[PDB]
Design a protein around this ligand. Structure first.
Ligand SMILES: *Cc1c(COP(=O)(O)O)cnc(C)c1O
Ligand SMILES: *Cc1c(COP(=O)(O)O)cnc(C)c1O
Lengths: 447, 447
């Protein structure tokens, strides 16, 4: 299949322009079958952004929002969905637990079907509950059962701090020596990303002593998308459980958790899934574990619905991940996530990933064409080894590139000493966004 | 001080009517300094309630909503508060984490001050996070540390199912025999409530072997309000930790968790606190434990704010209950709770408890006057031994009282075989509500 760089160059030829011409981005936007989804979101205006220098920008232009990997833009329908539940609460109060589009007792289950295609799992394998790191702990309390022979947790070095702290506290819970039991894979000297052959070597050599492998799906800092099925197979080959924090993977890369045989996973909803800060999180457990991996911590919402409200204190635990659901679900959080997932349903992950590959590929192409020496893309170059996000470093001692970018209405993340992350997302970022960004960047780098 | 029954009879004398006259309820409503708060809430109309028989009711009359102990009515300002955060998310997206009335990073801390007077604790002793039973588990993982000598958990028999399941799973986590380690105080033969002298006897006799006492503040089924400071002192006398599930206490009875020296507590926000189904829950840990009782499960939101976002993976744990906060807080849930707590701030728990004593006392008076033989109030009669809620049973073999009540727009809870709970709450229930309810009840009982 045609690589992004080649698509860009072929399109330019057809248009009779240079691949770096604005006309290429405009054409790609015209051909984008997902173009209409941008209208489904509230996009900030440049003049409203706190760090913006108004002298440097055109008023009433949209922001170039490349932070959708961290805090996803708002589906316009969030308010409408909230209003449905507020109106029910106003009109019938307590009766809302049992009636309506989203009966509160089953608020989570009413929309979980919309997650099936996003993570590649069945309805009984997915729970919508709590918060990401909270879910990580709930799962680890059942999946991490260390023995004298098999007691290690394997993860990447420089994991996201929350996961790092979670893993540390899990080890401390069992009185395990951290330095000996917390195995962290570091890159080779002079490299920032991990080589798959190196990960697999560690697993092959140390796997017998490892209880659980807990990796990110996409590493937050490098933008590296790890080979989930390869790590899963390798870990299970050595008798390890393999789970993933998919915070930067869900709604970004395509996922087949069930078919890949992943043991468990967890994710948040306020990044690529656009549900709003601190939104209701998610958990997956493969159905193969439904009768054998039981919740460590139980609440009444792990009791089967049909008899839960008998309140006879005779537990009837739901098999699989829903047995891990402790409390009644927050309807208001269900509302905002639901609005987002209806959009994902219409777009499809297949079509979104297709646009992403071309969009991020176009960004990479323009960067490398303009500065192919000063500018380094740390994110892996193989299209299958990254998602939306590129992590980029700069060697310009006199310029804080990030500061100059944010002053001009580019919303992205800082990488110290002198770099960005940027993640154009297919739902609401355009090829023209990418074109405009690269122009601002070039203008900054030229001084 | 004057008992409710005596207030009712004195008022009637002044009015020159019988204490059972409608004019007494109308007068009490006129004198109610909290009368205006009823306008702050969306009260269902009778015709909108699913089980209502329209032939039996007057259209456009308000429901008699006595289920505010289970799902509290909606503050009208919830929508407005949500809109503030949705507007910020629309306007500045990611920048909302750090700016505004409720910067998302500190969404919980921005409103925690409003809880101080409600639970009687300092800002560093209160966390707003997660869900009730979830918080119970987080606290028990740190407070329940069984030894061969001291391994029991003490609770009431027929505790709320979620707490029952939580306590059971906590015991199983340590491989403890449930029947031997789960000590449940049952009432004497022919009684439904517990005697304080009996609770204290169990504590005195068995206290040395008990690691944690975990009681409800108000028992959901009987409506009994336990003497929290007495149980706390008695338990600590024997070296036990004493914690409470305050789900039916917070926003109902007055609380002084800090001054009483309670070790820990947890509560929900969708009952008397009116925050909406599955709302953000609460946790208390006495400051005396801040440096000695550490979280079992850690996430990045337990790391001090000033260095959290350095993301260097070097934990700097916040002392006390905020060290137990694992994840970033849900802004949308913060919003709805905030709207409610502003109302509580204006009303004050002191004034609300005062109205409650008179209101529930008036309900009890009318019931007992009309049927002082057929009708039994299980809830303790001492004003200090109950909150808003009365639990009532009926001996009428041919009438399902609950069914007849709900058909007429009375919203309450069922008690099998033939009984209610009812909880008139001072924020939005009136003395006239109580009058109307008793009339419907009398009419039902007469047949
Ligand atoms: C309502 C109630 C619960 C409900 O638990 P959630 O965790 O909020 O679902 C738990 N415990 C008690 C004592 C209650 O009254
Ligand atoms: C953003 C992120 C988190 C944040 O954790 P919460 O529990 O949602 O506060 C955790 N882990 C990873 C890998 C992330 O990218």
């Amino acid at each position: 299949l045609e690589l992004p760089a080649d698509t860009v160059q072929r399109i330019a030829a057809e248009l009779k322009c240079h691949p770096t011409d604005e006309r290429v981005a405009l054409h790609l936007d015209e051909e984008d079958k997902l173009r209409h989804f941008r209208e489904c979101f509230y996009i900030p205006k440049i003049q409203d952004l706190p760090p913006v220098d108004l002298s440097l920008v055109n008023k009433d232009e949209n922001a170039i929002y490349f932070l959708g990997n961290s805090l996803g833009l708002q589906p316009k329908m969030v308010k409408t969905y909230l209003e449905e539940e507020l109106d029910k609460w106003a009109k019938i109060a307590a009766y809302g637990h049992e009636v309506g589009k989203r009966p509160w007792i089953t608020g989570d289950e009413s929309i979980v079907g919309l997650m099936k295609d996003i993570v590649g799992a069945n309805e009984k394998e997915i729970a919508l509950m709590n918060a990401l790191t909270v879910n990580l702990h709930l799962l680890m309390l059942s999946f991490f059962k260390p023995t004298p022979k098999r007691y290690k947790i394997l993860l990447e070095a420089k994991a996201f701090p929350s996961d790092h702290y979670a893993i540390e506290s899990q080890l401390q819970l069992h009185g395990l020596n951290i330095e000996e039991s917390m195995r962290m894979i570091k890159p080779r000297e002079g490299e920032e990303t991990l080589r798959i052959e190196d990960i697999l070597e560690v697993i092959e050599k140390e796997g017998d002593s490892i209880a659980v492998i807990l990796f990110s799906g996409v590493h937050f800092y490098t933008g590296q998308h790890f080979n989930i099925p390869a790590i899963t197979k390798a870990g299970q080959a050595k008798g390890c459980y393999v789970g993933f924090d998919l915070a930067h993977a869900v709604g970004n890369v395509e996922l087949y958790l069930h078919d890949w045989g992943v043991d468990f996973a967890c994710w948040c909803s306020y990044k690529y899934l656009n549900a709003g800060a601190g939104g209701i999180a998610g958990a997956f457990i493969h159905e193969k574990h439904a009768h054998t991996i039981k919740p460590a911590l139980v609440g009444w919402f792990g009791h089967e619905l049909s008899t839960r409200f008998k309140m006879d204190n005779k537990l009837q635990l739901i098999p699989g991940v829903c047995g891990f659901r402790i409390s009644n679900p927050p309807i208001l959080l269900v509302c905002s996530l639901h609005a987002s997932l209806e959009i994902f349903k219409q777009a499809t992950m297949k079509a979104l990933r297709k646009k992403s590959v071309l969009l991020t590929g176009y960004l990479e192409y323009l960067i490398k064409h303009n500065y192919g020496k000063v500018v380094n893309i740390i994110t892996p170059s193989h299209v299958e080894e990254r998602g939306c996000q590129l992590t980029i470093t700069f060697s310009v001692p006199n310029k804080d590139v990030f500061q100059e970018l944010e002053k001009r209405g580019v919303v992205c993340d800082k990488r110290n000493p002198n770099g960005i992350r940027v993640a154009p997302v297919p739902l609401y970022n355009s090829f023209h966004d990418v074109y405009k960004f690269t122009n601002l960047l070039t203008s900054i780098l030229d001084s």
